[PDB]
Amino acid sequence: IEGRHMAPTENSTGVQDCYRGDGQSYRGTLSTTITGRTCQSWSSMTPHWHRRIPLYYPNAGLTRNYCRNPDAEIRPWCYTMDPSVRWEYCNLTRCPVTESSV
Numbered sequence: 001i002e003g004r005h006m007a008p009t010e011n012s013t014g015v016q017d018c019y020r021g022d023g024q025s026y027r028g029t030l031s032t033t034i035t036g037r038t039c040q041s042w043s044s045m046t047p048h049w050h051r052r053i054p055l056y057y058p059n060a061g062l063t064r065n066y067c068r069n070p071d072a073e074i075r076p077w078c079y080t081m082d083p084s085v086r087w088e089y090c091n092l093t094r095c096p097v098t099e100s101s102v
Contacts, residue, residue: 002091005035011089012075019092024069024076028090033067037080037088041065047083067091 003017015034021027031038041064042050054062062068067090069076076090 002030002032003035007035010034012093015089015091015093017091017093018095019075019090020095020098022072023074023090023092024072026068028067028076028092029063030091031064031066033076033078033080033088033090035091037082037085039065039067039076039090040079040081044081047081048079048086050079 001017001019003015007015009015017034033039040048040050042062043053043064044050045053060070065081067076067078069078074094075092077087078090079086080088
């Protein structure tokens with residue numbers, strides 16, 4: 001989990017940083033994504049329109065810019081603060097330990 005710049009890439013098999021269990025299971029608290037990007041606080045309208053602000057959706061409970069995803073899958077998928085991305089995967093990757101059955 002977490003890390004610094006080193007891998008010239010990202011998205012699943014692009015950047016380092018391994019996850020555990022369900023990277024997008026309402027966990028993490030890293031508020032980061034990859035090696036120089038965040039989740040973009042859902043409300044900070046400046047670089048890019050994050051998404052349906054806490055007015056249309058049933059106020060689920062987004063942790064500001066805490067790298068995460070609305071529903072689920074395996075890894076989060078939210079924009080970043082860096083005005084040169086608009087989208088990035090949280091610093092979480094398949095670790096060579098945990099497995100998956102269901």
